[PDB]
Structure 1
């Protein structure tokens, strides 16, 4: 029993070391292209791509396109967009049913921050969504190129 006790004490020190070391690396890793908010992490690729390409990049990386589900998440995402000074694509589209935006899973939106008058399906061909540097949303043509930002 004393042997196991010694083992536990050792593990406690090793875990404490990992926690401290990892806490430091979290900050290092997110600088300058990442943003943590709650349990979610947004990270930009630093370049622009059309929706389909951006979506694939995020999915293959084990995440998905930025999908802010609260004002707080949206504000965090906005910080990255502002820092890079490039509007970015969100994950939602109304490709299936015009006028009804959904997440990649098909679920309807639980949050939105549409600019006044949006979505307006301008030209009758805007089924993707972009977030501006001011944090507001606008439906935009999926064929256009916007900043690639994924969430993990």
Structure 2
């Protein structure tokens, strides 16, 4: 029918405006504590927690901790860490097998950006160092999971 055609063209307009409005509100939301990379979105809570606290926080929020699988994804996190001037915990650990860092899924790294001479598993008073922190410069450093670091969740 011809009226059905009218309803469809109306929907096209409505959908177009929804798309425009949403694109704008994506940018607004991400400023300043969020970064979009691919279909991923990293966002910092602005606070610091231990690794396991941060892991619960991100999960409770409906996401997970950041698993940067590329340089572009790693760069985004670097920007958040820089803006906050606080090193942040990544999602990876080598708790299962020492020396081998893994994603929460069980699969080994497909990307890495260790700083000079890392990891080393030397946390001093803290003891072992099974988690990973990322610096403002984007470099990685294994660190005692019990330390407090910037919380960044991946959605």
Deviation, 1:38, is 1.6
- Give 1:3-18 correspondences, 5 Å limit: 3-18=3-18
Aligned length: 152
Aligned ranges for residues 114-133 of structure 1 at < 5 Å? 114-123=114-123, 125-133=128-136
Query: What's the offset of the Cα at 1:45?
Result: 0.4
Structure 1: stretches of 5+ with no match in the other structure: none
Aligned to 1:150: 153
Stretch of structure 1 that moved more, 105-114 or 120-129: 120-129
- Equivalent residue for 1:28? 28
Residue 117 of structure 1: how far off its partner (Å) = 1.0
Moved over 2 A (4+): none
TM-score scaled by length of structure 2: 0.96
Map Cα deviations across residues 51-85 of structure 1 (whole Å, 9 max, x no partner): 00000000111111111100110011100000000
Aligned to 1:94: 94
Q: Normalising to structure 1: TM-score of the pair?
A: 0.97
**Structure 1 residues 1-10 or 78-87, which shifts more?**
1-10
Unaligned runs of 5+ in 2: none
